[PDB]
Amino acid sequence: DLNVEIVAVERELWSGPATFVFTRTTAGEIGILPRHIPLVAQLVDDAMVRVEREGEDDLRIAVDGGFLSVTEETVRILVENAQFESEIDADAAKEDAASDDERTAAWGRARLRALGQID
Amino acid sequence: DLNVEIVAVERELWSGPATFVFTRTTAGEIGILPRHIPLVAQLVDDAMVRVEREGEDDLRIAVDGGFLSVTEETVRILVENAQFESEIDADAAKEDAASDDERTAAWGRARLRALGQID
Ligand SMILES: C[As](C)(=O)[O-]
Ligand SMILES: C[As](C)(=O)[O-]
């Protein structure tokens, strides 16, 4: 018989200018300015990424299975899944926040952080 | 300032045995049996993929921006997005089926085909 593999291709969610980028990594919290040494990190499980940019409100992204890759000319965020503050279900985020499964609570907290609801 | 890139990594949606795989490509409709010459195709815009397998109901996937890659030992389906018959919103599929935007109608039709609702 056949082996079938159904694969979702890599895809860019958003790309834009930033003055500051803040998130929480396994080695701790980090803030990346335009002049920054190259870096590779793994975001914490309930990580939120705050993107500050000239002329716009902060962009906040709940991030699931996130990795960071600060090269010389880019801050690259590789995500298993993410949703932007615009997309989040504020009700469902608090529902998943209640630790049903621990992996469910991280995605709930990450989302509450992107709503500015939790620290 | 910084260039930020937010990237969703490639991810395997499903992988399993199959006896038959049916879908509609730009060069026409194709059915791939265990013994098959290698092939590369682009699925049509409102494509649905039918996976037949021993001991189970057919698996149907609405596919968006799909490509097919039949190698010697795998049928690999690369998708921009997809949803399985289980996940689809049957009501919203008919709502998007009404050609609001032509790209919206393809995703609506692809989904109706995975419900077995349209041919
Ligand atoms: C490594 As496989 C056969 O689960 O795509
Ligand atoms: C090629 As680009 C700067 O839009 O990731």
Cα A52 → chain centroid: 14
| Residues in Cβ contact with A38 at an 8 Å cutoff, skipping those fewer than 6 apart | A70, A71, A72
Please tell me what DSSP assigns to residue B43.
B
Other beta carbons within 10 Å of B30: 16
Closest by CA position to A77, among listed A7, A3, A12, A9 = A12
Please name the residue that has the structure tokens 């939790």. Answer: A118
Q: Answer whether B88's CB lies under 8 Å from B115's CB.
A: yes
3-state secondary structure of A15: strand
3-state secondary structure of B75: strand
Q: Answer whether B50's CB lies under 8 Å from B58's CB.
A: yes
User: Resolution in A, one decimal?
Assistant: 2.1
User: Cβ B7–A10 below 8 Å, yes or no?
Assistant: yes
Which positions in chain B touch A76 (Cβ < 8 Å)? 4-5, 7
Cα separation, B87 vs B101, in Å, equals: 22
Q: Pick the atom of ligand 2 nearest to B3's CA.
A: 3
Q: Helices marked H in chain B — which ranges?
A: 90-97, 102-114
User: Cβ A15–B8 below 8 Å, yes or no?
Assistant: no
Other beta carbons within 10 Å of A111: 30
Cα B89 → chain centroid: 16
Cα separation, A84 vs A5, in Å, equals: 29
CA of A25 to the centre of ligand 1 (A): 30
Cα separation, A63 vs A70, in Å, equals: 17
Q: Is the CB of A5 under 6 A from ligand 1?
A: yes
User: Cβ B10–A14 below 8 Å, yes or no?
Assistant: no
Other beta carbons within 10 Å of B19: 13
Residue type at position B10: E
Q: Identify how the structure was determined.
A: X-ray
Please tell me what DSSP assigns to residue A55.
T
Closest by CA position to A66, among listed A116, A98, A99, A113 = A113
Strands across the sheet containing B59-64: B28-32, B20-25, B48-52, B59-64, B81-84
Other beta carbons within 10 Å of B7: 18
For A51-79, letters b (16+ CB in 10 Å) and e give bbbeeeeebbbbbbbbbbebeeeebbbbb
Q: Which own/partner pairs from B115-118 qualify as long-range (CB within 8 Å, at least 24 positions apart)?
A: B115/B60, B115/B85, B115/B88, B115/B90, B116/B60, B117/B90, B117/B93
- Which H or E element spans position B6? strand B2-8
